[PDB]
Amino acid sequence: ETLNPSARIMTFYPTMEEFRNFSRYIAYIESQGAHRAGLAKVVPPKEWKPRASYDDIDDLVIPAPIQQLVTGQSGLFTQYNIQKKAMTVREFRKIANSDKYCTPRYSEFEELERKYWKNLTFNPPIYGADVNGTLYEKHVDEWNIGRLRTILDLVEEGVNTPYLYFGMWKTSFAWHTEDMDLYSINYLHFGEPKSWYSVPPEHGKRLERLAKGFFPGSAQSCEAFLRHKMTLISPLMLKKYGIPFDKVTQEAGEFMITFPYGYHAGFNHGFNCAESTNFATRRWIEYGKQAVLCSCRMVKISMDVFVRKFQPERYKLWKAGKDNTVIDHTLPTPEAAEFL
Numbered sequence: 479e480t481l482n483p484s485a486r487i488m489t490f491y492p493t494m495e496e497f498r499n500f501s502r503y504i505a506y507i508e509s510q511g512a513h514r515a516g517l518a519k520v521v522p523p524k525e526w527k528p529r530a531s532y533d534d535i536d537d538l539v540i541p542a543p544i545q546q547l548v549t550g551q552s553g554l555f556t557q558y559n560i561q562k563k564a565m566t567v568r569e570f571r572k573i574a575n576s577d578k579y580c581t582p583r584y585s586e587f588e589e590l591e592r593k594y595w596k597n598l599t600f601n602p603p604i605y606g607a608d609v610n611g612t613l614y615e616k617h618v619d620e621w622n623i624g625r626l627r628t629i630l631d632l633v634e635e636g637v638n639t640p641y642l643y644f645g646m647w648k649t650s651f652a653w654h655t656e657d658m659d660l661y662s663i664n665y666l667h668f669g670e671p672k673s674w675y676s677v678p679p680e681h682g683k684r685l686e687r688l689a690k691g692f693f694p695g696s697a698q699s700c701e702a703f704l705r706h707k708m709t710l711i712s713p714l715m716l717k718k719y720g721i722p723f724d725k726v727t728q729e730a731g732e733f734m735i736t737f738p739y740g741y742h743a744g745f746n747h748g749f750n751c752a753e754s755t756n757f758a759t760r761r762w763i764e765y766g767k768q769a770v771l772c773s774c775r776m777v778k779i780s781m782d783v784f785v786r787k788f789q790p791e792r793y794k795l796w797k798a799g800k801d802n803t804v805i806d807h808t809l810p811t812p813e814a815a816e817f818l
């Protein structure tokens with residue numbers, strides 16, 4: 479496709495008028511080829527804020543903080559989670575900003591990225607991950623992660639509910655695509671940046687083949703082992719084996735969109751808070767039908783409801799096992815037609 483052939487991460491700056499319709503805007507960014515990178519950044523208008531202040535969240539409970547223990551060498555690592563007892567944002571912030579766990583001194587991102595890949599196996603940090611909740615005020619109607627109102631609402635597992643992530647320096651998310659190969663939206667509420675790596679959906683099978691070659695025991699035990707979210711592969715290792723990828727830094731007040739079958743990984747620069755959920759478009763339905771799921775082991779959605787409503791003509795063929803549709807990763811969502 480002639481739209482974003484380079485498959486690079488695109489950044490969008492919608493106006494207040496453009497921003498109001500979430501689904502229409504996702505269709506627009508696809509028309510521009512954003513989905514080819516597997517990840518896109520959306521900077522909201524300056525006037526828009528999801529909450530007036532974050533000064534009242536000190537006693538918010540993180541029910542399951544996880545100590546992230548990383549094992550490995552030469553750019554290949556396995557991350558093990560150790561669940562710790564519940565803690566408040568106040569206690570978490572104290573640990574995150576402490577001498578033991580704070581961000582190192584650095585000039586450029588390249589320097590901090592080097593410190594991360596050099597030290598990720600030392601001094602395990604605590605990630606205040608998967609907190610059920612939202613930091614959005616009730617009246618916020620634009621890009622409200624708690625209520626995006628996409629076709630995924632036809633489901634109601636709990637993949638439509640928002641989650642909070644309290645990060646600290648060196649906390650990481652391993653290589654993975656979304657459950658059922660869905661889209662995701664991530665908003666960084668406040669704090670230090672979050673760095674991301676992405677592999678374009680058209681090259682995802684190459685990452686999987688690499689990952690299978692490196693962890694053959696894990697591959698034998700589960701076809702979809704990358705869904706366990708424990709595998710960390712450095713950009714140098716990707717470059718060495720010709721896996722195309724891109725990187726981007728998300729700063730406080732910016733949105734990241736992940737696209738169906740877009741593999742992503744990354745880390746937190748320091749104390750911060752992000753809000754995340756999954757969503758869908760008509761384009762996702764085929765990805766949902768073809769997704770390879772964790773067999774050992776997990777989030778599974780019955781596609782029946784989506785095929786009946788959006789592909790009635792293919793329902794009989796698909797239930798009989800005769801729907802041999804091949805996904806073209808470069809094609810935009812049908813809703814994008816108005817922009818094409």
Ligand SMILES: [Cl-]
Nearest residue numbers: 532533535571
């Ligand atoms: Cl705070």
Ligand SMILES: [Zn+2]
Nearest residue numbers: 655656662736
């Ligand atoms: Zn994700």
Ligand SMILES: [Zn+2]
Nearest residue numbers: 700772773774
């Ligand atoms: Zn598994």
